Symmetry: D2
Subunit: 106 residues, 4 copies
């Protein structure tokens, strides 16, 4: 799906996780976030359209997705161990990654 | 690209990294492998075609791509700090990951 | 060094990274933080002093050091590839980790 | 404890994991390996005694422990999810890391 579509999926699921009561709700939302982040990997954002695809900007753009994907991987291990409150707080650590990439490229 | 397409990209670029004589050749191959791994995220392999998407078999299948994506992340940091022998030796690491997923799911 | 000693090292070096003007100053501070985090691995904090060592509370306590050590690993790769603004911004990432463990266990 | 003492702990526990039948045996051994790797962080190996502590050799020596500690972190998540055979195979991925550091520094 397109970069904005993936960002809506990330946004909607981060809010689901915040409001969640149980591990099943949290696991399902993190699974959707993992798929959206992986799908966004290859996107070129509008502000980097005129850069070479090998520019340090596009390199640093993709580095943000490595950080986000790694954080979702850990949050899912914590949810699958039944540590719901820990998985929810780990989902809050995602916000810094969201903000760092937005600050530079949104 | 379909799973088989992404796999040929991973296979071709893993070979380039083993044969490479300079950092630019390793970096280019690692970047292509990262794109192929992220794009493979969404695929259902033939052995799991009749498993539900949000099943445990599909969760366990996708976990191998988190491992691979993390190994490519590290290899690219080694290549970009000029440690090209070290970056190439990351290939021995990636191959174990390739082999574990194939043993279970191919 | 005891836990309190390691914590002062983490606190002092996190400040150096925020104030740093060059890569060498950030790298030196990150290396000191990595040594302090690894050395804190073995500590039993006051709130868990009466929990068994191989208990779940102590496992959950030590998991925060895996997160911190992983964040310092990435920040040092960013500093060593010359991305010093990016390396300093890793401080916002580390501080979340500091705060999550303190909220639960301090 | 000293570097050789930590290496005996890593060796003995890697063999325990290989021979293990259940998740409790695997979890206990990985926990011991996590403590030994963290304790070995700050060691200077005999072959790098005459190098500066900031040499790229000592930097690359410590990088191996980041890789090992990360791999033990994942293996423990897999054991705590009850995926015993996956945790055992993840423990086998440690061998490449063992060999890469030994090849250079043992
Ligand atoms: C870069 C590596 C990013 C990360 C990590 C995240 N986002 Fe993002 N986001 C990014 C860009 C380049 C853009 C702009 C896209 C455009 O075409 O203009 C965005 C945009 C969003 C939006 C707005 C979507 C819209 O208006 O249609 C949202 C709501 C959003 N991003 C949310 C979001 C969240 C919740 C993230 C982490 C969990 C996150 N993004 C990460 C680049 C990057
Ligand atoms: C799961 C997480 C996998 C990882 C990691 C890697 N591979 Fe893979 N690969 C996987 C599957 C399920 C399949 C079969 C796909 C199908 O529809 O047939 C494959 C296939 C290959 C092939 C094709 C040859 C074959 O015998 O089918 C190749 C050449 C291949 N994969 C290479 C490869 C490499 C080099 C990897 C790591 C660097 C790698 N794969 C990882 C599942 C997974
Ligand atoms: C658990 C995994 C922790 C992480 C990660 C960090 N800290 Fe910590 N810190 C922790 C404990 C249990 C304690 C109390 C120790 C005691 O015996 O009293 C502390 C203490 C501190 C202190 C001392 C001040 C206080 O109010 O007790 C400081 C200044 C401190 N920690 C700083 C710090 C920083 C900067 C961290 C991340 C970069 C950090 N800590 C992580 C447990 C854990
Ligand atoms: C560097 C980053 C290393 C990693 C990762 C591992 N080992 Fe190691 N090991 C390392 C050095 C520098 C040495 C030599 C120490 C010396 O003082 O000469 C070793 C040694 C060992 C030994 C021999 C111990 C002895 O003879 O007393 C063993 C059995 C050993 N190492 C096992 C081992 C295993 C099982 C590892 C991964 C699971 C591993 N080591 C990682 C440096 C590094
Ligand atoms: Cl980030
Ligand atoms: Cl794997
Ligand atoms: Cl944390
Ligand atoms: Cl290694
Ligand atoms: Mg738009
Ligand atoms: Mg495709
Ligand atoms: Mg100490
Ligand atoms: Mg000796
Ligand atoms: Zn974890
Ligand atoms: Zn899992
Ligand atoms: Zn946390
Ligand atoms: Zn960041
Ligand atoms: Zn080909
Ligand atoms: Zn690294
Ligand atoms: Zn980079
Ligand atoms: Zn001080
Ligand atoms: Zn990185
Ligand atoms: Zn380095
Ligand atoms: Zn994992
Ligand atoms: Zn755990
Ligand atoms: Zn594996
Ligand atoms: Zn290696």
């Amino acid at each position: 799906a397109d970069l904005e579509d993936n960002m809506e999926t990330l946004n909607d699921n981060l809010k689901v996780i915040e409001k969640a009561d149980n591990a099943a709700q949290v696991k399902d939302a993190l699974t959707k976030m993992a798929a959206a982040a992986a799908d966004a990997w290859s996107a070129t954002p509008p502000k980097l359209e005129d850069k070479s695809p090998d520019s340090p900007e596009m390199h640093d753009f993709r580095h943000g997705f490595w950080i986000l994907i790694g954080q979702i991987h850990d949050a899912l291990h914590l949810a699958n161990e039944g540590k719901v409150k820990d998985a929810q707080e780990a989902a809050e650590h995602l916000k810094i990654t969201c903000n760092h990439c937005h600050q530079k490229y949104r």
